[PDB]
Coordinates of C-alpha atoms and ligand atoms in Angstrom, one line a residue:
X21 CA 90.7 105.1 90.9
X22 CA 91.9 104.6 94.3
X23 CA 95.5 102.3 94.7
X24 CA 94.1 101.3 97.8
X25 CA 91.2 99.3 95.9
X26 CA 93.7 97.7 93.9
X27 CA 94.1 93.9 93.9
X28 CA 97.5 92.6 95.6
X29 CA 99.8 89.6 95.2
X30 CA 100.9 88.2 98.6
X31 CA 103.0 85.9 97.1
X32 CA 100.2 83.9 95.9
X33 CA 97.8 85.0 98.4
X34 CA 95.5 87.8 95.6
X35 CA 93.9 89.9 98.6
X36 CA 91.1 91.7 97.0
X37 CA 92.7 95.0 97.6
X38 CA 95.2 97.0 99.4
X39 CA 93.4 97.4 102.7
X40 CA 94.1 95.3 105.7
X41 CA 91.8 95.0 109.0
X42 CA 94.2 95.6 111.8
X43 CA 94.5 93.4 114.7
X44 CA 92.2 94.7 117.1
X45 CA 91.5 93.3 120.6
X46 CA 88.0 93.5 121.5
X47 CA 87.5 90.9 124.9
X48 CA 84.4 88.8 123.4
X49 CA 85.7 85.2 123.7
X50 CA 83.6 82.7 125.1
X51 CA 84.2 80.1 127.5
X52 CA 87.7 79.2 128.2
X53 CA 88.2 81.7 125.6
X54 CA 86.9 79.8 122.4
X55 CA 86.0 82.1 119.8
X56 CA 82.3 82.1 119.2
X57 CA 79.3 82.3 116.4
X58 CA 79.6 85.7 117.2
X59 CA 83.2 86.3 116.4
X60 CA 82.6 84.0 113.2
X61 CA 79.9 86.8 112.1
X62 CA 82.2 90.1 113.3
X63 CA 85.2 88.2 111.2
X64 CA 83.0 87.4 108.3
X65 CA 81.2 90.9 108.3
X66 CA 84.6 92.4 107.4
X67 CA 86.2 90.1 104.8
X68 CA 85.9 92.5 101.9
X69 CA 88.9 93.7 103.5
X70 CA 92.0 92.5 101.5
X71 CA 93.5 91.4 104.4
X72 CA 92.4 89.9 108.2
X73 CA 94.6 90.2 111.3
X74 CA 93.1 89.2 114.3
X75 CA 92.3 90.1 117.1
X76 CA 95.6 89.2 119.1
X77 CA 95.1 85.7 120.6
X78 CA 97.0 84.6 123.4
X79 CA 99.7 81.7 122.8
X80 CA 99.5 79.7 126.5
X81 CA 97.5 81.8 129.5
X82 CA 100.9 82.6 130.7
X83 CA 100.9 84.7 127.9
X84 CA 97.1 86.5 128.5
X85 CA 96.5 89.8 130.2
X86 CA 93.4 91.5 129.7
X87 CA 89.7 89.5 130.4
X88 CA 87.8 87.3 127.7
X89 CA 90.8 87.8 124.8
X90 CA 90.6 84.1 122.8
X91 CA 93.6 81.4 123.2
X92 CA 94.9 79.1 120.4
X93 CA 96.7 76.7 122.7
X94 CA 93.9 74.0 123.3
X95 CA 92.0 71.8 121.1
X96 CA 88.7 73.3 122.1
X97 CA 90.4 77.2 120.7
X98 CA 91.2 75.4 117.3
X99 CA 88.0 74.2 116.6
X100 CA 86.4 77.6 117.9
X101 CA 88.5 79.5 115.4
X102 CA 87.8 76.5 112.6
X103 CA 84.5 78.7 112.6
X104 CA 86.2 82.1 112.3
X105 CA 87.9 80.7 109.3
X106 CA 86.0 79.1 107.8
X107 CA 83.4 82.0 107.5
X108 CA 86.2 84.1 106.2
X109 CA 87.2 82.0 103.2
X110 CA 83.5 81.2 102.9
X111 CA 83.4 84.9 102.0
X112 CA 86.7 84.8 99.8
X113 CA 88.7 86.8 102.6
X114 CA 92.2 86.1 103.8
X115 CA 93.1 85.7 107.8
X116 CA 95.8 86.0 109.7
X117 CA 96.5 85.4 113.4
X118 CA 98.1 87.1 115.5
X119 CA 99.8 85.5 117.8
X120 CA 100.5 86.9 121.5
X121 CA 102.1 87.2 124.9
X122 CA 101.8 90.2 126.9
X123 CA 104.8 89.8 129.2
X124 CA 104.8 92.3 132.4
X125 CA 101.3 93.8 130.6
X126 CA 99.5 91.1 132.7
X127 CA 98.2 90.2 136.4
X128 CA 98.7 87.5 138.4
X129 CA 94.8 87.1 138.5
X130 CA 95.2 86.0 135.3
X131 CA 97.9 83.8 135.5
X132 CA 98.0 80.1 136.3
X133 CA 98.2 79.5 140.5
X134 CA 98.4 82.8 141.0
X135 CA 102.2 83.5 139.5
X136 CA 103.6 86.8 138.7
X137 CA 103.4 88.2 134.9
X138 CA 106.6 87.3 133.1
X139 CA 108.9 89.8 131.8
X140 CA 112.7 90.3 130.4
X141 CA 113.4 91.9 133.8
X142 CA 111.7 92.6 136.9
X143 CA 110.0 96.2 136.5
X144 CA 106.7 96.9 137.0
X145 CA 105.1 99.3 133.8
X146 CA 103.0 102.7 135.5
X147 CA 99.5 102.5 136.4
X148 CA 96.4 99.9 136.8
X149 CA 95.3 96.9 135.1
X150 CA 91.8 95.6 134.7
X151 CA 91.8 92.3 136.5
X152 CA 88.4 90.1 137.0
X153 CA 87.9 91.5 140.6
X154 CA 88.4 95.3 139.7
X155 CA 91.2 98.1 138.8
X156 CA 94.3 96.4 140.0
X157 CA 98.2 98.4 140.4
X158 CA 100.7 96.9 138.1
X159 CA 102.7 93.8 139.9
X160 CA 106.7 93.9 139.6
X161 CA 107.0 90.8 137.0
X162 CA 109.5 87.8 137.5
X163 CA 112.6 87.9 135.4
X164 CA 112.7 85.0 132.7
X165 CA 115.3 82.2 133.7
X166 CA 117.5 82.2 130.3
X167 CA 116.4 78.3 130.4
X168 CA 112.7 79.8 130.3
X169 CA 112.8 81.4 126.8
X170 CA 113.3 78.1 124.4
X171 CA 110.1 77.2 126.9
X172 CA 107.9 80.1 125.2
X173 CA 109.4 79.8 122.2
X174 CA 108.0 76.7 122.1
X175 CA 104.7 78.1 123.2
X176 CA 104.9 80.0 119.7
X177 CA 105.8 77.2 117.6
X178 CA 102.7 75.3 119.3
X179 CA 100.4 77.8 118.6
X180 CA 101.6 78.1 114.8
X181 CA 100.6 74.4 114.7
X182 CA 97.1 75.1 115.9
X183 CA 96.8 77.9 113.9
X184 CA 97.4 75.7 110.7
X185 CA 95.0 73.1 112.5
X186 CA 92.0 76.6 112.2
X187 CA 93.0 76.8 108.9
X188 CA 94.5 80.6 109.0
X189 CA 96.1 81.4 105.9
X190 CA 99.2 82.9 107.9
X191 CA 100.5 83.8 111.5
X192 CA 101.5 87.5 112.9
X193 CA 103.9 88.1 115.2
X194 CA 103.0 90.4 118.2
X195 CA 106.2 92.3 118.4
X196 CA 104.8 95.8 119.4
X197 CA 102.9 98.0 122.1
X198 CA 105.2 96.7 125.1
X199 CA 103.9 93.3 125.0
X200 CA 106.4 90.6 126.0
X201 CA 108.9 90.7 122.6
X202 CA 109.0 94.3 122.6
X203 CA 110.0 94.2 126.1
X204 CA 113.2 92.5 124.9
X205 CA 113.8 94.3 122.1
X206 CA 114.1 97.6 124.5
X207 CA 116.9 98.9 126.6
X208 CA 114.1 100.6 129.2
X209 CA 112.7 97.3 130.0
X210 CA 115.2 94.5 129.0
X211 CA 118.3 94.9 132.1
X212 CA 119.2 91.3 130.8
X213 CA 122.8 90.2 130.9
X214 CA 122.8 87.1 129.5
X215 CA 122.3 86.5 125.5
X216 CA 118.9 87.9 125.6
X217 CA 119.9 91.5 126.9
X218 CA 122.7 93.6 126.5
X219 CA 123.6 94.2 122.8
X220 CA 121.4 95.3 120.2
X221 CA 121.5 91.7 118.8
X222 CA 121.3 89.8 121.9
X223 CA 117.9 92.3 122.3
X224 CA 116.9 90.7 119.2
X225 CA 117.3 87.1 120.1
X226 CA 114.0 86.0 121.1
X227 CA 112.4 87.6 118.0
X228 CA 114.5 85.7 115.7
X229 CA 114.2 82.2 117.8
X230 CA 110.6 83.1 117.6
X231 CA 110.9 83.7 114.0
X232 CA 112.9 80.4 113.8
X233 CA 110.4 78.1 115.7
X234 CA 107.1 79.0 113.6
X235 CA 109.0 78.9 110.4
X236 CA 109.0 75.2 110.9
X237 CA 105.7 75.3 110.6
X238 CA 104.5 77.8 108.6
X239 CA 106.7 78.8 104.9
X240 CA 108.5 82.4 105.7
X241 CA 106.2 83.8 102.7
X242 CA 102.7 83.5 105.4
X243 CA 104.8 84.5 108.7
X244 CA 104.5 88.3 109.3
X245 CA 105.4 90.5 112.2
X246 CA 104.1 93.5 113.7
X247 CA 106.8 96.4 115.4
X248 CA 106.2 99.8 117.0
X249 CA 109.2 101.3 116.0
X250 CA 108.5 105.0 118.4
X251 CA 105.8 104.2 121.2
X252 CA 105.6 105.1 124.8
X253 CA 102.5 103.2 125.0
X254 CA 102.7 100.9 128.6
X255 CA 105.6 102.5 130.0
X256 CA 108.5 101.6 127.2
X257 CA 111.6 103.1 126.1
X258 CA 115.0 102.6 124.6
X259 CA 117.9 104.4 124.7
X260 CA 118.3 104.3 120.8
X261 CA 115.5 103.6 118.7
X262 CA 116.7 104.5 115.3
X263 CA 120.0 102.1 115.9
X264 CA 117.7 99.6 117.7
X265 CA 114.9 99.1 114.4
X266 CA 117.1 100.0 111.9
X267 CA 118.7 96.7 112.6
X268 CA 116.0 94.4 113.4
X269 CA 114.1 96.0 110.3
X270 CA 117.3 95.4 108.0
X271 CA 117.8 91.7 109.6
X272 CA 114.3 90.9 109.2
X273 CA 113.8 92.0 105.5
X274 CA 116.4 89.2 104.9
X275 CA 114.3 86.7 106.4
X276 CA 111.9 87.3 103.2
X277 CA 108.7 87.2 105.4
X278 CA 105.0 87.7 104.7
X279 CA 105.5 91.5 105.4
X280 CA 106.7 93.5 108.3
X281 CA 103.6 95.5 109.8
X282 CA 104.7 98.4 111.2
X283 CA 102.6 101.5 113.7
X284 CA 103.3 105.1 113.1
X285 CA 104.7 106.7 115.5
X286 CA 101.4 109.1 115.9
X287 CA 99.0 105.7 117.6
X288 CA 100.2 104.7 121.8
X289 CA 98.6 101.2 121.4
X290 CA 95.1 102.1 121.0
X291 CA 94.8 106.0 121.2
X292 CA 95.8 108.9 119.0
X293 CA 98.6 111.0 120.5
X294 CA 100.6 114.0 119.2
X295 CA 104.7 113.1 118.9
X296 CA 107.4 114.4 117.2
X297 CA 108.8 110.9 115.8
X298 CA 111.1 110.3 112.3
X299 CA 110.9 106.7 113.3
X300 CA 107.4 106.0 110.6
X301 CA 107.4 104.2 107.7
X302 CA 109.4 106.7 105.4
X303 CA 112.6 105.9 107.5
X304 CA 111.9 102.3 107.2
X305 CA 110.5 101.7 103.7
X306 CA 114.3 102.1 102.3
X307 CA 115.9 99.4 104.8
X308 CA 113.0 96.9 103.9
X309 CA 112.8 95.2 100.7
X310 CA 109.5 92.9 101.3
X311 CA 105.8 93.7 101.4
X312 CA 105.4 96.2 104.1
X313 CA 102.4 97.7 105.6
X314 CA 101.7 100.6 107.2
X315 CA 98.9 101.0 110.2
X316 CA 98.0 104.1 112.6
X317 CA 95.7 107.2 112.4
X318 CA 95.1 106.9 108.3
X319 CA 92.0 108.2 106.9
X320 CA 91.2 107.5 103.0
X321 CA 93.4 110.4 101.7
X322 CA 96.5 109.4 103.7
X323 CA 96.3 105.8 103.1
X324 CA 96.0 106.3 99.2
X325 CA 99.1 108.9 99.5
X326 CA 101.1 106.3 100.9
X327 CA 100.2 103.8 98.5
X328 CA 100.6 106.4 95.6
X329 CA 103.8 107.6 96.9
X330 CA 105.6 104.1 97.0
X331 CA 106.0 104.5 101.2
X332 CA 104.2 101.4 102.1
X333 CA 102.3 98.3 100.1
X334 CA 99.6 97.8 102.3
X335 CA 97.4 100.5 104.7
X336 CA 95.9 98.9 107.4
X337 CA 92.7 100.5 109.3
X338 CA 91.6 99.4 113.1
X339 CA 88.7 101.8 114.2
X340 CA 87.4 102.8 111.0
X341 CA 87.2 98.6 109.9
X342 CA 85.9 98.3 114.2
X343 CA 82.4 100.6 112.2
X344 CA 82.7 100.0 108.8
X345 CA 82.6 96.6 108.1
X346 CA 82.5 97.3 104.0
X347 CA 85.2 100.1 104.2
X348 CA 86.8 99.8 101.3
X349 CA 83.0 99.9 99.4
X350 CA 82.5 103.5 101.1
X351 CA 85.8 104.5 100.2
X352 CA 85.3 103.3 96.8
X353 CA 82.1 105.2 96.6
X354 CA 83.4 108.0 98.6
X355 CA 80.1 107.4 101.0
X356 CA 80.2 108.3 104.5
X357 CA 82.0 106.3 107.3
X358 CA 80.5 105.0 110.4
X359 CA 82.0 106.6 113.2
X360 CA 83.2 104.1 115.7
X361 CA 82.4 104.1 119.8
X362 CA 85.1 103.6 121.7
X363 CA 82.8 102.8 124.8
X364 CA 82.1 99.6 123.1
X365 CA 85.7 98.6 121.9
X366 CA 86.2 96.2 124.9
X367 CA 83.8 93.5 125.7
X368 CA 80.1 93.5 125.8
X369 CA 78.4 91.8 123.1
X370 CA 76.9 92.5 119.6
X371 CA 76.7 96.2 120.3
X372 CA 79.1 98.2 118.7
X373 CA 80.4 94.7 117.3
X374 CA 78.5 93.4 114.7
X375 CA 75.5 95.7 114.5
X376 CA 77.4 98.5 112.4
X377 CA 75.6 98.6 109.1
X378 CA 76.6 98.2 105.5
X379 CA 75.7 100.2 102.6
X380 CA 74.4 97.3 100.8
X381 CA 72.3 95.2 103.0
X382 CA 73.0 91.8 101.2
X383 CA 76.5 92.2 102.2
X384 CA 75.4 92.1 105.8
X385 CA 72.6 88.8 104.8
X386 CA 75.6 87.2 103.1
X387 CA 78.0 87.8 106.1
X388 CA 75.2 86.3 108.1
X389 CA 74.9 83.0 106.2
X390 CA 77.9 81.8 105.8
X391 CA 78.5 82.8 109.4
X392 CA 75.6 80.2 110.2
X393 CA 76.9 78.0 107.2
X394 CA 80.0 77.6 109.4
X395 CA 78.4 77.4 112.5
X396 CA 76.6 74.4 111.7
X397 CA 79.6 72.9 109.9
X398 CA 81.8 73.4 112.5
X399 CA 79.3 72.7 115.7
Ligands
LIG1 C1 90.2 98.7 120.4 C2 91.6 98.4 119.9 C3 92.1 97.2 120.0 C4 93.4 96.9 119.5 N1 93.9 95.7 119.6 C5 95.2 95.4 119.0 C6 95.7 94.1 119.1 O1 95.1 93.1 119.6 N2 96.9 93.9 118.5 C7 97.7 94.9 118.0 O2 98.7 94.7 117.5 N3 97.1 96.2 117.9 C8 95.9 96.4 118.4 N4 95.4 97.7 118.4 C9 96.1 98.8 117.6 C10 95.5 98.7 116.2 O3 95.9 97.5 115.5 C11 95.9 99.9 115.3 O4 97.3 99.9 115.2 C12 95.4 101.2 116.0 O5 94.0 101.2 116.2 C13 95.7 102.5 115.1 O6 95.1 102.4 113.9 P1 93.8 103.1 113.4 O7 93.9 104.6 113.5 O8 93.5 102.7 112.0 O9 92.7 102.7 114.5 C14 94.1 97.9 118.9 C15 93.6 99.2 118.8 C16 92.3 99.4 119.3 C17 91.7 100.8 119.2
LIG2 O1 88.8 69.4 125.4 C1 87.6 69.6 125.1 C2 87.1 69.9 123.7 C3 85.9 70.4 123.5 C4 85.4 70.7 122.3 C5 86.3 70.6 121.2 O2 85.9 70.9 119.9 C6 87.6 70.1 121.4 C7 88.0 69.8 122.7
LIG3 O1 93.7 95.1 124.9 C1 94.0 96.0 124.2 C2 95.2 95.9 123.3 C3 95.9 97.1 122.8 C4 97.0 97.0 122.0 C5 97.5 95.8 121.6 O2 98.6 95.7 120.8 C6 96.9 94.6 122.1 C7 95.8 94.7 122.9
LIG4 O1 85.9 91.2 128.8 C1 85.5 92.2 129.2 C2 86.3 93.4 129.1 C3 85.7 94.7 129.4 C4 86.6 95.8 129.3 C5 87.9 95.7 129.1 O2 88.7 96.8 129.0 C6 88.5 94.4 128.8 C7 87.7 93.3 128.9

């Protein structure tokens, strides 16, 4: 009955339905943040999702900003995800990474000897970060040399590489929620005056040399990217946001990508907050002629009216996937959700992780074995 429990073609990738897992950071990497057995299981619980994005995973520590998020720049992070992956797929699902760099949303706590957060320009964004050693105030970040940017580039292309090495079936871009692209693509942070600031296009830049660079590695058709068109989430602004997405929206639907991802306007990173925005995917749907999905404060009704109504291709769900591992089986059987604790969002361990129970309990048994299947195979 329900669109969303339709199969979909991702241009050769059939995901089991319409639903996609949104990237959701949740700080439970281990050691020298290699994903764990644990993460195998929480990844494995919820491939009856059509779709997996991860958890965003940091591209070099430069690019790392909050405690105990996983890496995919060393050999020991590949072979920790090989185990996320291979659980998934085990299960028939389909994973993505997302791939990160958090720009000024950082501390130098985090950062190798102690340098300052890296950033298009050198502002500081409002408030505290959470550091190792306690709430922290915000550090002014260093300004990118225009020499610097091929170097993280770079960074991305690398990490594309080890993320075909895990054996993810695509690669996200993290271009949203003030991170370090979205700080270029926005007038309010980016006070560049060389090619990287300035114009709308020279705003752009770094996106598409990113684009470029992990395209080499991965086919366009299994490299998506992920925008917040109309957020003030972590102090960010532009001066024109319609002009600004309507033309990295219409340049990147010629790039014929895995899909553009794109928030509504209603989510500020990880909350819900109450806007007046015409910036959701309505305005965009028009000026994008791939697969395009559609993420941000849906329930069942509103994801299946967006489906039904030819606005988006794919609805994807963070908290409600965060406590209902076999969502699309409740929707299907219009059973009642899980609610999800935000108190256990953010580190800890199996609590409020994996322990969120299924309506059929072979699901969670299956989950289980092929997450030990994997560890053992992948030791
Ligand atoms: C705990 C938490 C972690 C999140 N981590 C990420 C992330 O790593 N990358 C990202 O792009 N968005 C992240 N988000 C935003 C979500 O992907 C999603 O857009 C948001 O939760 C709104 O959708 P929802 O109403 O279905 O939860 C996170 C949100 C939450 C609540
Ligand atoms: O560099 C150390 C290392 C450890 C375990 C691995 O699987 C790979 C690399
Ligand atoms: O750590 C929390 C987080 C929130 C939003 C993101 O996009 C990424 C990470
Ligand atoms: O890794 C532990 C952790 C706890 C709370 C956070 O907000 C982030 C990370």
């Amino acid at each position: 009955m329900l669109k969303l429990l339709e199969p979909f073609d991702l241009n050769g990738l059939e995901l089991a339905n319409r639903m996609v897992m949104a990237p959701l950071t949740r700080n439970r990497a281990g050691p020298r943040f290699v994903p764990t057995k644990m993460n195998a299981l929480y990844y494995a619980q919820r491939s009856g999702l059509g779709l997996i994005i991860t958890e965003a995973t940091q591209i070099s520590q430069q690019g790392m900003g909050y405690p105990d998020t996983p890496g995919i720049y060393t050999d020991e992070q590949v072979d920790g995800w090989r185990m996320v992956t291979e659980a998934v797929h085990r299960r028939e699902g389909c994973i993505f990474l997302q791939l990160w760099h958090v720009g000024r949303v950082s501390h130098s706590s985090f950062q190798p000897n102690g340098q300052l957060p890296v950033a298009p320009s050198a502002i500081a964004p409002e408030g505290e970060v959470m550091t190792y050693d306690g709430i922290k105030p915000f550090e002014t970040p260093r300004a990118l040399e225009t020499e610097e940017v091929a170097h993280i580039v770079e960074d991305y292309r690398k990490a594309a590489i080890n993320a075909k090495r895990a054996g993810f079936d695509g690669i996200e871009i993290h271009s949203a929620n003030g991170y370090l692209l979205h700080e270029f693509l926005e007038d309010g942070t980016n006070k560049r005056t060389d090619r990287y600031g300035g114009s709308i296009e020279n705003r752009a830049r770094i996106v598409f040399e990113v684009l470029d660079a992990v395209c080499k590695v991965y086919p366009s058709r299994r490299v998506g990217i992920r925008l917040s068109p109309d957020t003030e989430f972590m102090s960010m602004s532009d001066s024109d946001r319609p002009a600004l997405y309507s033309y990295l929206v219409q340049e990147l639907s010629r790039r014929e990508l895995a899909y553009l991802h794109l928030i509504e306007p209603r989510i500020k990173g990880n909350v819900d907050v109450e806007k007046e925005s015409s910036l959701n995917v309505e305005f965009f749907r028009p000026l994008y002629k791939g697969v395009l999905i559609t993420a941000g404060g849906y329930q069942k009704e509103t994801g299946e009216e967006r489906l039904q109504k030819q606005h988006a291709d794919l609805v994807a769900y963070g908290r409600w996937v965060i406590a209902n591992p076999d969502l699309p089986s409740r929707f299907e059987q219009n059973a009642p959700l899980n609610p999800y604790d935000r108190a256990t969002f953010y580190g800890g361990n199996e609590k409020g992780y994996t322990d969120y129970p299924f309506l059929d309990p072979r699901d969670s048994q299956e989950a289980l074995k092929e997450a030990e299947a994997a560890e053992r195979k992948w030791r």
